[PDB]
Amino acid sequence: MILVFLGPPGAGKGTQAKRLAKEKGFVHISTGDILREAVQKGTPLGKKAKEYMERGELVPDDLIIALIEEVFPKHGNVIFDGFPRTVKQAEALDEMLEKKGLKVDHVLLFEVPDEVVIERLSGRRINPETGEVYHVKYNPPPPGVKVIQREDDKPEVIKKRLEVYREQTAPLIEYYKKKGILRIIDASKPVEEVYRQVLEVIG
Ligand SMILES: Nc1ncnc2c1ncn2[C@@H]1O[C@H](COP(=O)(O)OP(=O)(O)O)[C@@H](O)[C@H]1O
Ligand SMILES: Nc1ncnc2c1ncn2[C@@H]1O[C@H](COP(=O)(O)OP(=O)(O)O)[C@@H](O)[C@H]1O
Numbered sequence: 001m002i003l004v005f006l007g008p009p010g011a012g013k014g015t016q017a018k019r020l021a022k023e024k025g026f027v028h029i030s031t032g033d034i035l036r037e038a039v040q041k042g043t044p045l046g047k048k049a050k051e052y053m054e055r056g057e058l059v060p061d062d063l064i065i066a067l068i069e070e071v072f073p074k075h076g077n078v079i080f081d082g083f084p085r086t087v088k089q090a091e092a093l094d095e096m097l098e099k100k101g102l103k104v105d106h107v108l109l110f111e112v113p114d115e116v117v118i119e120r121l122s123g124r125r126i127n128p129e130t131g132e133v134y135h136v137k138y139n140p141p142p143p144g145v146k147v148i149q150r151e152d153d154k155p156e157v158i159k160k161r162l163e164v165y166r167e168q169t170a171p172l173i174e175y176y177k178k179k180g181i182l183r184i185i186d187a188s189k190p191v192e193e194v195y196r197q198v199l200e201v202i203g
C-alpha cells in the first residue's frame with residue numbers, strides 16, 4: 001500500500017514515517033533525507049539542489065520527479081514523506097504509480113498551526129552520526145551526545161519554507177480531497193498519540 005504524508009514543515013511527518021517504516025516494514029521515501037545525502041556527497045543532483053535547499057526554496061520538479069523514479073522500490077509498502085510538494089509532482093506521481101498498476105491509497109494531512117511549527121523546527125536537533133532526530137524540549141538528546149541544528153532550521157529560512165508550503169504545497173489538500181483519499185491527522189498532539197491516530201487511519 002501507498003501513503004502520502006502531507007502538511008507543513010515540522011508537523012512531525014518524518015518522525016511518524018520513520019516510526020511506521022521501522023515497526024510495520026513500510027519503505028520510507030524521504031526526499032529531504034535523500035537530497036541531503038546527495039548534497040553532502042556532491043553528486044550532480046546534490047550540487048544543483050544545494051542552493052534551493054539552503055534558501056528554503058523548492059528543488060525544480062523534473063529533478064525531483066526523476067529522483068523518485070530512481071528510488072521507487074519494485075516491491076513493498078511505501079510512505080511518501082515530503083513528496084509530492086507541488087501539483088505537478090502529484091500528477092506525475094499518479095501517472096508513475098499507474099504504469100505500475102499502483103495508486104495512492106491514503107493521503108494523511110498533518111494539521112498543526114503556524115505557531116507550533118516554529119517551535120518544532122527551531123528546536124529540531126540532529127545526531128550527525130546516526131541521523132536520529134531530537135527536539136530540545138520534547139525529546140532531548142541524551143547528555144554528552146553531540147548534535148547539530150540544520151541551516152534551513154534557522155528563523156529566516158523557516159519563515160520562507162512556511163511561505164513556500166502555503167503557496168505551492170497547500171493546494172495539494174484540495175487535489176487529494178477531490179479523490180476522497182485525504183484523512184486528517186491532528187499533528188498538535190504528543191508523538192504517541194499522533195502515532196496511534198496514524199495507525200487507526202491506515203487500518
Ligand atoms: N518533493 C520535493 N520537491 C522539491 N523540493 C524538495 C522536495 N522535498 C524536499 N525538497 C527540498 O529539500 C528541502 C528540505 O526538505 P524537507 O526535509 O522535506 O523539509 P522539512 O524541513 O520541511 O522537513 C526543502 O525545503 C526543499 O528545498
Ligand atoms: N507530536 C510531536 N510533538 C512534539 N514534538 C514533535 C512531535 N513530532 C515531532 N516533534 C519534534 O518536532 C520536530 C519536527 O519533527 P519532524 O518529524 O522532523 O517534522 P517534519 O518531518 O514534518 O518536517 C522534531 O525535532 C521532532 O523531534
Ligand SMILES: [Co+2]
Binds near residue numbers: 014030
Ligand atoms: Co523530514
